Design a binder for this molecule. Sequence first.
Ligand SMILES: C[C@@]1(N)Cc2cccc(c2)/C=C\C(c2ccccc2)=N\C(=O)c2cc(cc(-c3ccccc3C#N)c2)COC1=O
Length: 376
Amino acid sequence: SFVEMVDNLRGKSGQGYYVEMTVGSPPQTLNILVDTGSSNFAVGAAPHPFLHRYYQRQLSSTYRDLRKGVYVPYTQGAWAGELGTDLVSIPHGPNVTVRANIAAITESDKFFINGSNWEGILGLAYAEIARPDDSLEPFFDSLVKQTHVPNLFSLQLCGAVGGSMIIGGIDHSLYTGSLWYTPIRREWYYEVIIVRVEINGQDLKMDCKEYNYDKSIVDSGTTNLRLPKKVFEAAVKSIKAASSTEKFPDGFWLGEQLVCWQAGTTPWNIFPVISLYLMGEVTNQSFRITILPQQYLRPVEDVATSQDDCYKFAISQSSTGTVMGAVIMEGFYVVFDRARKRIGFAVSACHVHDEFRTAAVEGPFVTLDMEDCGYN
Ligand SMILES: C[C@@]1(N)Cc2cccc(c2)/C=C\C(c2ccccc2)=N\C(=O)c2cc(cc(-c3ccccc3C#N)c2)COC1=O
């Protein structure tokens, strides 16, 4: 029944998944980045070199200036704008219209991406991390309070881009196998708990507290699988050992160097699979999501339809905890079940795989003392 929401996401390889959103009156449709790592709805509202279009508040009769500024600094980039509210709809999303808070971005630094084709960002996380503070109600909260749309959305990000953002439910055609759920530990970022990490079936053997030191979150707006320094180092040592058939320069594993292969010759088979075990919904029960090199090895903006496929190792370090970005999400259909405070994972019907291996979601496994893996 959610068919009209299927394939409502677009994007350029490595630049961000976006959905169309129509704001104001008369209608002003813009391409908006789907971001589960933040909670502010904001759109470019002034000309910018990297922006094809922008929000023109003076042309919207329903726009209400809140007479207050807002500044938002992200892990990457930042912007400044004016707060206000206007009518908002998602053409290929739920059949409703709501009055939501909207930040009109007038200035920014290293936020927008040249050629990405998106002009704003939809922060889908909770109010706790919204700017200026948690009193600025996020878009999804307004949606649920003003309409009968169920408190849940799901994301199918298809990498090389496109995908689907199903709002108010789950579309069975977007995944195979069963959906496995992990609890949302706290409602601020979409925080989860990783209890075990394996490289080609081999346990990384680190104290699970290190996997979530600070926190572990799911962010559709982050490209890589980012890991805490100590975890990153151990993971890389293990991945290098498992892919010893061919040697690569140190810089490759640091994302400083790229390696290209003749079209259709990338030796996926020499790279290991990576499994992250997440806390399940029942005591001492966990499940695992497994990604292939096709997920963690990202394609880089082609030179011009050349006979060379260049890739970048998309697993990198973080000083603010684990971030399960696009590298993780592209292999699965992810359900953000806000209503039941849980996130579900299932094999995506569009994840890129080969004839030898496939991304997977498997369970259940017995894992004790999972509660002690979270940071307080
Ligand atoms: C909350 C927010 N998600 C906001 C945000 C900030 C800056 C840019 C974007 C979004 C645009 C979309 C984009 C994507 C997303 C999926 C697919 C393709 C591109 N992401 C990036 O480009 C991006 C985003 C972030 C860190 C690095 C980043 C920085 C340094 C080292 C490694 C990195 C990675 N990964 C790169 C931190 O993300 C955020 O703060």
